[PDB]
Short mmCIF file of C-alpha atoms in Angstrom, two decimals:
data_model
loop_
_atom_site.label_atom_id
_atom_site.label_comp_id
_atom_site.label_asym_id
_atom_site.label_seq_id
_atom_site.Cartn_x
_atom_site.Cartn_y
_atom_site.Cartn_z
CA UNK A 1 64.40 -40.13 6.29
CA UNK A 2 64.40 -40.72 10.02
CA UNK A 3 67.33 -42.89 10.80
CA UNK A 4 66.81 -44.84 13.99
CA UNK A 5 69.08 -47.47 15.46
CA UNK A 6 68.62 -49.82 18.36
CA UNK A 7 70.51 -52.61 20.11
CA UNK A 8 69.79 -55.48 22.50
CA UNK A 9 68.05 -58.78 23.07
CA UNK A 10 68.29 -61.49 20.40
CA UNK A 11 64.83 -62.99 21.24
CA UNK A 12 62.78 -60.47 19.26
CA UNK A 13 65.44 -59.67 16.69
CA UNK A 14 63.52 -61.44 13.95
CA UNK A 15 60.20 -59.70 14.58
CA UNK A 16 61.76 -56.23 15.13
CA UNK A 17 63.59 -56.77 11.86
CA UNK A 18 60.28 -57.84 10.27
CA UNK A 19 58.40 -54.82 11.73
CA UNK A 20 61.25 -52.60 10.62
CA UNK A 21 61.36 -53.79 7.00
CA UNK A 22 57.64 -53.20 6.68
CA UNK A 23 57.86 -49.75 8.37
CA UNK A 24 60.32 -48.52 5.74
CA UNK A 25 58.16 -49.72 2.78
CA UNK A 26 55.65 -47.45 4.33
CA UNK A 27 57.70 -44.57 5.67
CA UNK A 28 61.13 -44.64 4.14
CA UNK A 29 62.27 -44.38 7.77
CA UNK A 30 64.83 -46.92 8.92
CA UNK A 31 65.18 -48.73 12.23
CA UNK A 32 68.49 -50.52 12.44
CA UNK A 33 68.62 -53.25 15.08
CA UNK A 34 71.76 -54.70 16.60
CA UNK A 35 71.03 -58.17 17.87
CA UNK A 36 73.70 -58.05 20.54
CA UNK A 37 72.12 -59.46 23.68
CA UNK A 38 70.15 -58.07 26.60
CA UNK A 39 73.26 -56.90 28.47
CA UNK A 40 74.59 -54.69 25.68
CA UNK A 41 71.05 -53.46 25.21
CA UNK A 42 71.07 -51.81 28.62
CA UNK A 43 74.81 -51.00 28.41
CA UNK A 44 74.33 -49.14 25.09
CA UNK A 45 71.20 -47.22 26.12
CA UNK A 46 72.68 -46.10 29.44
CA UNK A 47 75.83 -45.23 27.45
CA UNK A 48 73.52 -43.15 25.30
CA UNK A 49 75.03 -44.73 22.19
CA UNK A 50 71.68 -45.81 20.65
CA UNK A 51 68.09 -44.56 20.42
CA UNK A 52 66.62 -47.47 22.35
CA UNK A 53 67.84 -50.54 24.16
CA UNK A 54 66.14 -53.89 24.46
CA UNK A 55 66.25 -56.50 27.18
CA UNK A 56 64.19 -59.57 28.09
CA UNK A 57 64.38 -59.25 31.87
CA UNK A 58 62.89 -55.93 33.16
CA UNK A 59 65.00 -53.42 35.09
CA UNK A 60 63.84 -52.41 38.60
CA UNK A 61 62.00 -49.17 39.26
CA UNK A 62 64.94 -48.04 41.40
CA UNK A 63 67.50 -48.53 38.64
CA UNK A 64 65.14 -47.13 35.99
CA UNK A 65 64.68 -44.01 38.14
CA UNK A 66 68.45 -43.79 38.65
CA UNK A 67 69.47 -43.98 34.96
CA UNK A 68 66.41 -41.99 33.88
CA UNK A 69 64.55 -44.59 31.83
CA UNK A 70 61.08 -46.12 31.08
CA UNK A 71 60.30 -49.71 29.98
CA UNK A 72 57.47 -50.87 27.73
CA UNK A 73 56.75 -54.45 26.62
CA UNK A 74 56.31 -55.16 22.95
CA UNK A 75 56.00 -58.89 22.33
CA UNK A 76 55.19 -61.98 24.29
CA UNK A 77 56.94 -65.35 24.13
CA UNK A 78 56.29 -68.75 25.70
CA UNK A 79 58.20 -71.73 26.99
CA UNK A 80 56.84 -75.26 26.55
CA UNK A 81 58.11 -78.72 27.74
CA UNK A 82 59.45 -80.83 24.83
CA UNK A 83 58.92 -84.52 25.58
CA UNK A 84 59.95 -87.88 24.14
CA UNK A 85 57.48 -90.41 25.51
CA UNK A 86 56.90 -93.61 23.49
CA UNK A 87 53.42 -93.55 22.04
CA UNK A 88 52.33 -90.17 23.39
CA UNK A 89 51.09 -87.68 20.81
CA UNK A 90 51.80 -83.95 21.23
CA UNK A 91 49.60 -82.04 23.72
CA UNK A 92 48.36 -85.25 25.34
CA UNK A 93 50.23 -85.31 28.63
CA UNK A 94 49.16 -82.68 31.18
CA UNK A 95 51.72 -81.77 33.91
CA UNK A 96 51.70 -79.97 37.30
CA UNK A 97 54.00 -77.33 38.71
CA UNK A 98 54.91 -79.37 41.78
CA UNK A 99 55.18 -82.49 39.67
CA UNK A 100 57.41 -80.70 37.13
CA UNK A 101 59.71 -79.26 39.80
CA UNK A 102 59.94 -82.86 41.11
CA UNK A 103 61.02 -84.20 37.74
CA UNK A 104 63.66 -81.48 37.59
CA UNK A 105 64.75 -82.22 41.17
CA UNK A 106 64.97 -85.93 40.44
CA UNK A 107 62.29 -86.97 42.88
CA UNK A 108 60.38 -88.39 39.90
CA UNK A 109 62.08 -91.11 37.84
CA UNK A 110 59.43 -92.99 35.82
CA UNK A 111 56.78 -91.63 33.54
CA UNK A 112 54.37 -94.24 34.86
CA UNK A 113 55.03 -92.62 38.24
CA UNK A 114 51.83 -92.40 40.26
CA UNK A 115 52.10 -88.59 40.58
CA UNK A 116 52.03 -88.17 36.83
CA UNK A 117 49.41 -90.89 36.47
CA UNK A 118 46.76 -89.17 38.58
CA UNK A 119 46.98 -86.14 36.32
CA UNK A 120 46.39 -88.30 33.24
CA UNK A 121 43.47 -90.80 33.74
CA UNK A 122 42.97 -92.54 30.42
CA UNK A 123 46.67 -92.83 29.75
CA UNK A 124 48.73 -95.93 29.19
CA UNK A 125 51.75 -94.47 31.01
CA UNK A 126 55.06 -96.28 30.31
CA UNK A 127 57.55 -97.64 32.82
CA UNK A 128 60.19 -95.49 31.09
CA UNK A 129 62.93 -93.59 32.87
CA UNK A 130 62.78 -89.79 32.78
CA UNK A 131 65.76 -87.92 31.27
CA UNK A 132 66.12 -84.27 32.20
CA UNK A 133 67.74 -81.74 29.86
CA UNK A 134 68.29 -78.29 31.29
CA UNK A 135 69.98 -75.41 29.54
CA UNK A 136 73.78 -75.52 29.29
CA UNK A 137 74.54 -71.90 28.57
CA UNK A 138 73.37 -69.04 30.79
CA UNK A 139 70.05 -67.85 29.47
CA UNK A 140 66.79 -65.91 29.92
CA UNK A 141 64.72 -69.06 29.27
CA UNK A 142 66.36 -70.67 32.27
CA UNK A 143 65.68 -67.46 34.13
CA UNK A 144 62.02 -67.71 33.06
CA UNK A 145 61.58 -71.41 33.74
CA UNK A 146 63.12 -71.40 37.23
CA UNK A 147 60.96 -68.38 37.99
CA UNK A 148 58.02 -70.67 37.17
CA UNK A 149 59.15 -73.60 39.24
CA UNK A 150 60.19 -71.42 42.17
CA UNK A 151 56.54 -70.36 42.58
CA UNK A 152 54.97 -73.80 42.20
CA UNK A 153 57.44 -76.07 44.00
CA UNK A 154 58.29 -75.35 47.63
CA UNK A 155 61.56 -77.32 47.43
CA UNK A 156 63.11 -75.96 44.23
CA UNK A 157 62.72 -72.44 45.57
CA UNK A 158 64.68 -73.32 48.66
CA UNK A 159 67.56 -75.30 47.19
CA UNK A 160 68.23 -74.09 43.63
CA UNK A 161 66.05 -71.05 43.06
CA UNK A 162 66.00 -68.80 40.00
CA UNK A 163 68.38 -67.11 37.57
CA UNK A 164 70.00 -67.33 34.15
CA UNK A 165 72.21 -70.14 35.47
CA UNK A 166 71.36 -72.22 38.52
CA UNK A 167 72.79 -75.22 40.38
CA UNK A 168 70.91 -77.80 38.42
CA UNK A 169 70.35 -80.93 40.56
CA UNK A 170 70.02 -83.33 37.59
CA UNK A 171 69.93 -83.60 33.84
CA UNK A 172 72.09 -83.21 30.79
CA UNK A 173 72.86 -79.64 29.72
CA UNK A 174 72.35 -78.77 26.06
CA UNK A 175 73.60 -75.57 24.42
CA UNK A 176 70.70 -73.37 23.26
CA UNK A 177 67.12 -74.49 22.38
CA UNK A 178 69.15 -76.43 19.75
CA UNK A 179 70.99 -78.51 22.30
CA UNK A 180 67.87 -79.25 24.29
CA UNK A 181 65.54 -80.38 21.47
CA UNK A 182 68.30 -82.31 19.73
CA UNK A 183 68.88 -84.43 22.86
CA UNK A 184 65.15 -84.69 23.42
CA UNK A 185 64.66 -86.01 19.93
CA UNK A 186 67.67 -88.33 20.38
CA UNK A 187 66.50 -89.94 23.70
CA UNK A 188 63.31 -91.86 24.62
CA UNK A 189 61.91 -90.72 27.94
CA UNK A 190 63.60 -87.25 27.69
CA UNK A 191 62.22 -83.87 28.73
CA UNK A 192 63.57 -80.35 28.17
CA UNK A 193 61.98 -76.88 28.38
CA UNK A 194 62.16 -74.93 25.11
CA UNK A 195 60.76 -71.76 23.48
CA UNK A 196 57.34 -72.29 21.88
CA UNK A 197 58.57 -70.90 18.61
CA UNK A 198 61.45 -73.40 18.22
CA UNK A 199 59.28 -76.25 19.41
CA UNK A 200 56.70 -75.42 16.73
CA UNK A 201 58.34 -75.41 13.29
CA UNK A 202 60.67 -78.21 14.44
CA UNK A 203 57.74 -80.39 15.49
CA UNK A 204 58.78 -80.94 19.06
CA UNK A 205 56.01 -82.66 21.00
CA UNK A 206 54.86 -80.58 24.00
CA UNK A 207 52.71 -80.91 27.09
CA UNK A 208 49.73 -79.14 28.47
CA UNK A 209 50.25 -77.65 31.89
CA UNK A 210 47.81 -76.97 34.68
CA UNK A 211 46.96 -73.18 34.89
CA UNK A 212 47.42 -71.30 38.22
CA UNK A 213 43.66 -71.59 38.64
CA UNK A 214 43.45 -75.37 38.01
CA UNK A 215 42.22 -75.71 34.43
CA UNK A 216 44.76 -77.55 32.14
CA UNK A 217 46.03 -75.42 29.26
CA UNK A 218 47.67 -75.95 25.89
CA UNK A 219 50.31 -73.45 24.82
CA UNK A 220 48.92 -71.17 22.07
CA UNK A 221 49.60 -67.57 21.14
CA UNK A 222 46.17 -66.79 22.63
CA UNK A 223 47.06 -68.27 26.03
CA UNK A 224 50.42 -66.46 26.22
CA UNK A 225 48.64 -63.17 25.78
CA UNK A 226 46.14 -64.10 28.49
CA UNK A 227 49.03 -64.21 31.00
CA UNK A 228 49.80 -60.55 30.30
CA UNK A 229 46.09 -59.94 30.57
CA UNK A 230 46.44 -61.14 34.16
CA UNK A 231 49.20 -58.75 35.36
CA UNK A 232 48.46 -55.58 37.39
CA UNK A 233 50.61 -53.39 35.05
CA UNK A 234 49.48 -49.98 36.31
CA UNK A 235 52.66 -48.48 37.80
CA UNK A 236 55.33 -51.12 37.36
CA UNK A 237 55.61 -52.54 33.82
CA UNK A 238 58.46 -54.70 35.13
CA UNK A 239 56.06 -57.72 35.09
CA UNK A 240 56.76 -61.44 35.46
CA UNK A 241 54.25 -63.54 33.53
CA UNK A 242 54.77 -66.87 35.23
CA UNK A 243 51.95 -68.76 36.96
CA UNK A 244 49.77 -65.77 36.24
CA UNK A 245 46.29 -66.14 37.68
CA UNK A 246 43.32 -65.99 35.31
CA UNK A 247 41.72 -68.18 32.65
CA UNK A 248 43.58 -70.11 29.91
CA UNK A 249 46.86 -68.45 30.82
CA UNK A 250 49.90 -70.42 29.70
CA UNK A 251 51.70 -70.65 33.06
CA UNK A 252 55.09 -70.01 31.45
CA UNK A 253 55.03 -66.75 29.57
CA UNK A 254 57.61 -64.08 28.99
CA UNK A 255 57.66 -60.65 27.33
CA UNK A 256 60.59 -58.52 26.20
CA UNK A 257 61.31 -54.85 26.95
CA UNK A 258 62.26 -51.62 25.11
CA UNK A 259 64.26 -49.03 27.09
CA UNK A 260 64.26 -45.31 26.16
CA UNK A 261 65.40 -42.29 28.21
CA UNK A 262 62.83 -39.81 29.53
CA UNK A 263 64.74 -36.56 28.79
CA UNK A 264 65.52 -36.48 25.08
CA UNK A 265 68.63 -34.43 24.21
CA UNK A 266 67.64 -35.34 20.64
CA UNK A 267 63.80 -35.27 20.78
CA UNK A 268 63.88 -35.81 16.99
CA UNK A 269 64.67 -39.39 17.91
CA UNK A 270 62.45 -40.10 20.90
CA UNK A 271 59.43 -39.09 18.86
CA UNK A 272 60.48 -41.15 15.92
CA UNK A 273 61.02 -44.18 18.20
CA UNK A 274 57.63 -43.98 19.92
CA UNK A 275 56.06 -43.80 16.43
CA UNK A 276 57.67 -47.03 15.10
CA UNK A 277 56.41 -48.94 18.11
CA UNK A 278 52.88 -47.46 17.79
CA UNK A 279 52.79 -48.45 14.14
CA UNK A 280 53.77 -51.97 15.26
CA UNK A 281 51.15 -52.00 18.03
CA UNK A 282 48.65 -51.61 15.21
CA UNK A 283 49.75 -52.87 11.78
CA UNK A 284 52.61 -55.09 13.05
CA UNK A 285 50.50 -57.63 14.95
CA UNK A 286 50.04 -60.33 12.29
CA UNK A 287 53.72 -60.10 11.19
CA UNK A 288 54.62 -61.08 14.75
CA UNK A 289 51.89 -63.67 15.16
CA UNK A 290 53.18 -65.58 12.14
CA UNK A 291 56.71 -65.76 13.66
CA UNK A 292 55.09 -67.48 16.68
CA UNK A 293 55.10 -64.43 18.96
CA UNK A 294 51.89 -63.52 20.78
CA UNK A 295 50.61 -59.95 20.46
CA UNK A 296 50.17 -57.64 23.47
CA UNK A 297 46.52 -57.44 24.68
CA UNK A 298 44.95 -54.03 24.16
CA UNK A 299 44.31 -53.19 27.78
CA UNK A 300 48.11 -53.25 28.14
CA UNK A 301 48.73 -51.42 24.82
CA UNK A 302 46.45 -48.73 26.17
CA UNK A 303 48.39 -48.51 29.43
CA UNK A 304 51.74 -47.97 27.66
CA UNK A 305 50.18 -45.19 25.59
CA UNK A 306 49.13 -43.24 28.65
CA UNK A 307 52.48 -43.94 30.35
CA UNK A 308 54.16 -42.57 27.24
CA UNK A 309 52.02 -39.43 27.40
CA UNK A 310 53.36 -38.74 30.84
CA UNK A 311 56.98 -39.88 30.70
CA UNK A 312 58.88 -39.14 27.53
CA UNK A 313 59.44 -35.43 27.44
CA UNK A 314 62.06 -33.52 25.48
CA UNK A 315 64.96 -31.59 26.93
CA UNK A 316 62.51 -28.75 27.80
CA UNK A 317 59.38 -30.34 29.36
CA UNK A 318 57.25 -30.83 26.26
CA UNK A 319 55.77 -34.34 25.78
CA UNK A 320 56.70 -36.28 22.67
CA UNK A 321 53.39 -38.11 22.30
#
């Protein structure tokens, strides 16, 4: 009976809890998970009050090196644009990065706006006014979305930038992916970024987006993984998956991180933690896929394995994997 306990990000709480349940059936081992938020994830691990911490945004190599930690990504998420356009069927409209930053900056007011029209040829675009809905409460999705726009729009980067809360130029602010969709459903012409999972079993209509390499892409679990496929990875792990170059890569992808110390004062634990996550990197895939999370491509699973082999050592120099 290994008794593990973690704390952190709420994003993957449902899949970690799924993976956990299934790992006990099989091992009788138990991974408790405190869905407390990314901040407490890092605060608890550094405090050495839990076996592992979990956070959405990756810590810098400097700060990892200072607290004595290592990050490894487990699952991949995705943010889509929920739209309310009269007539338009889900996945029909294709957007741009510049064009999208322009909608969010207020430079674009009508859906039948030329700029959107040249991106959608056989489309009866309406003379409907665009309604922007950004996130009310400070959040990692806003952090992720502004990261996206900051790369693709020269203006947004220079006047509002990126973070969990920014100086939004326009648009209503809704609380949680709840607040956004709800308004979006409630208002014709509305547009609000939302997690792909929430959008999906709540039948939010979404858009395709133009990939960093041109080709328009639909958000699917496959295309979220492709973004990760496109990151260097080797010596960093703190990767941003937005506007990732490659083929069929959903331009707005995110992953979440697990934080464990390198020197294990209780190596009983470290070992037992690495195991749970290895079992998930194998058997746990489908459990995650069916909760709308993309799995981590194998090239990257392979790179964490090596990195484990050379980083988590017990109190006396012996590797734990």
